[PDB]
Design a binder for this molecule. Structure first.
Ligand code: NAD
Ligand code: NAD
Lengths: 450, 447
């Protein structure tokens, strides 16, 4: 029976049609998983040398076509040119990192561990990995999952978010040229496509997205290996001797990708002495950041309405709204301005919810110990920053914060070598660094009687 | 509070009446472990390792009581229980040492103008839920790395075998500090209440059905699963002379109640009959009640009966049953060799969890590998043969976390164990186990 599900995608900067795309249903998901399964034996049988070379060519091909990736990434996100260009560079770098890391791995030392036996330990891939990724960093979130998965010798079915299939489709095209047909397969679709993929004949699921989706996936993934990266609600603890550029730096991080980052600063926590300085300093810095000029739109109409709802429900006694300046002809885009909210209770909706927009709340604590309690007082625990001059104060807080990343006098700065990953309700995945490879491979002990 | 009335599996007679924990007791146990978490996590690695070394030595100092306790609800022979007490202490010493010797991604100037480093941090309170087949060792496998990583632990032993878990909690209190390890006896609903409690992670060892339930019940808690095996032993025609004796020894260890016990013997056509007869001769010398212990409980014995009755095996060799006088009411089942059976036979596809071996023939090593890898479960395997290229090529191809060559069921604290497929994806033993119980933190400092 002839049947095609269709999405008419729109540019978030303008609201106009940009792309009509067919969505994958059960037949396309089943076929994609079978294609990756069929490519698995030849891909896994490559030596590390040959596998690394393929991934290096993959990264160079992305780089060679970087202008095309930049346009594709911006079409569905509204990202500024400079942010998209940086993320294409970071994508290729991450692939190069794992290309090199897959040859440099270690295992428990081999030898005579049992009397009269020679033993060693080898690492082996899981098989087919499903990677399901959101719209906020389509290319980078794809790279975080497929990089280590492919490098560990798995094949991959990649399911991008409904509004941002574009770079995932280019990745599949360029992987076919450099890794081989079927090694990386992309299936565009909405949430239902993702659910079908989780129930398919894949060996593992690598998910990045909302907590509600994460909780649904846990149940329906069964005994498949599961890696979750969920929301953050990240604190920034600002001490009275914080450096002069603290407010500019925090506002720069909060308006990067229009504040649509898991690890963006959200909950600014000061002491009593610097509370009003921080509110005014953040308000002045944010006011210089104009939506439509200095950062992009929110991804879609649901995000903009959600922003509106949380702002309306907040009991903030102080509210500073930055300018809204959509370019000519872009009034139909999902533009929302920067906001600073202050004078609000510890359980305020703007504090407790992940706003996912350039909104900063400001709370005051009596002393560093209460600031730490506020910072660690949320169920999510992903990233954090500390701002201050005194080594003992900031490094002690850095050890105490419940987060996979703690920045001191900076925020939202990442590199392929250093891990990222949550606690609490943020999921327990590890992205970046050599530590990410372990999620996609399993050890085998071989013990030989002499 | 409900009271469980436990019986001795060697006799069927009452042996212990012990409280079965419900929600109030589970909730209080988790709060006790949570209250101990801050001081335990604050110990330096030097002090934490010294605590765990004293824990291991206290267990060995009290090994006679651990042996009696372990045997009481299992029926294990004395020599097997004594060896498992030694392995328990050794594993604790291994993780005492490993916790000081860890590494992390190298620190330094990874970003311009930034100094970065990576530290490891505990999850918090870990729930350890373990089965009755190796009560002490499976407790050790979970609590060892969890405690060494700075977590406190709530340990939920199987209903029929709380005995050594209670001793561990007493001896942990004396060496690690009160509340660092808390033991909660109970049944599967005690375990479900623990999964739903305010623990940060669940480390589970047991049946596939329970694992599937726990996945849905555990929510966003970090989860580690060690589930069933159905382990093949590929026996080539040039396998060494002691092959059948060694396979039978591994299959009757702990009355075959091992996740990694050999189950599916797979030969070629030229050595098929030799294997059936050699295994039957070796198994016939192992008499249930003298040379190995009972099955754990009446459910296990009935499960044995159902699988054997359902099998379409054309060949069946039954070893003798010889329970001592006074032990006629225990859950005794004999060793068995089954052969001449289809590839989807119940005895082949199910984990019998008793001293039963099936024997199947393949045309060549390629088809032997297909059979060995043709099950949903994928935990451990062995290969028996003399030629280096043949056995080592098979060892690479088998889907298993452990492959033994010309041996079976031999483990040590340094070397990992862990499943694929429907066997779960946890890692036990080796330094690799520690990662399940800790999380990295990148600290990046602006210069
Ligand atoms: N922890 C991290 O590293 C990280 C990184 C980026 C984003 N995030 C989080 O992701 C969230 C973004 O929200 P969103 O609305 O884009 O997330 P979402 O969960 O709605 O969508 C994410 C992806 O999952 C798919 N999906 C949704 N429900 C599914 C289901 N039941 N089964 C299978 N697939 C399903 C979607 O189609 C999409 O591809 C934020 O909470 C953010 O913090 C976390
Ligand atoms: N390393 C491994 O992979 C490994 C090691 C030993 C045993 N095993 C497997 O363990 C199995 C033993 O079977 P069994 O019947 O004793 O196991 P089981 O799953 O019935 O019980 C195991 C433990 O889990 C508890 N439990 C049961 N259901 C639960 C639930 N829904 N939620 C929480 N806790 C629950 C029980 O009370 C007990 O403490 C075998 O299949 C064997 O292969 C695996």
């Amino acid at each position: 029976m002839e049947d095609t599900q269709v999405a008419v995608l729109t540019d978030p900067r303008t609201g106009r049609e940009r792309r009509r795309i067919a969505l994958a249903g059960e037949p396309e998901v089943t076929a994609a998983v079978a294609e990756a399964r069929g490519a698995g034996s030849a891909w896994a049988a490559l030596t590390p040398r040959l596998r690394a070379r393929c991934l290096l060519r993959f990264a160079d091909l992305i780089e060679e076509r970087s202008a095309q990736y930049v346009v594709a990434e911006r079409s569905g996100t509204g990202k500024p040119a400079a942010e998209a260009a940086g993320e294409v560079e970071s994508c290729a770098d991450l692939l190069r990192f794992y290309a090199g890391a897959l040859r440099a791995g270690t295992a428990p030392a081999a030898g005579r561990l049992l009397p009269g036996r020679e033993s060693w330990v080898r690492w082996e891939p899981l098989g087919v990995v499903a990677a399901i990724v959101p719209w906020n960093y389509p290319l980078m979130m794809a790279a975080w999952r497929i990089g280590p998965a492919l490098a560990a010798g798995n094949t991959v079915v990649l399911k991008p978010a409904l509004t941002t299939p574009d770079t995932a489709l280019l990745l599949a095209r360029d992987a076919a040229e450099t890794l081989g047909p079927g090694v990386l397969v992309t299936v565009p679709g909405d949430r239902d496509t993702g659910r079908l993929l989780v129930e398919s004949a894949v060996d593992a699921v690598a998910f990045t997205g909302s907590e509600a989706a994460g909780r649904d996936i846990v149940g329906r993934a069964g005994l498949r290996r599961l890696s979750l990266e969920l929301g953050g609600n990240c604190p920034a603890v600002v001490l009275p001797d914080a450096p002069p550029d603290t407010y500019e730096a925090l506002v720069r991080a909060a308006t990067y990708n229009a504040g649509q980052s898991c690890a963006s600063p959200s909950r600014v926590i000061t002491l009593r002495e610097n509370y009003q300085q921080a509110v005014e300093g953040l308000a002045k810095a944010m006011h210089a950041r104009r939506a439509g000029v200095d950062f992009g739109p929110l991804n879609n109409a649901d995000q903009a309405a959600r922003y509106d709802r949380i702002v309306a429900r907040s009991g903030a006694g102080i509210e500073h709204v930055a300018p809204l300046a959509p370019p000519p002809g872009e009034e139909g885009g999902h533009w929302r301005p920067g906001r600073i909210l202050a004078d609000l209770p510890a359980d305020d909706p703007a504090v407790c919810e992940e706003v996912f927009a350039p909104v900063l709340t400001v709370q005051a604590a009596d002393d560093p110990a209460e600031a730490l309690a506020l910072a660690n007082g949320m169920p999510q625990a992903l990233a954090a920053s500390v701002w201050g001059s005194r080594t003992d104060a900031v490094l002690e807080l850095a050890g105490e914060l419940n987060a996979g990343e703690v920045w001191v006098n900076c925020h939202l700065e990442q590199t392929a070598e250093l891990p990222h990953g949550g606690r609490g309700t943020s999921g327990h995945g590890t992205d970046m660094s050599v530590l990410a490879l372990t999620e996609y491979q399993r050890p085998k002990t071989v013990t030989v009687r002499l």
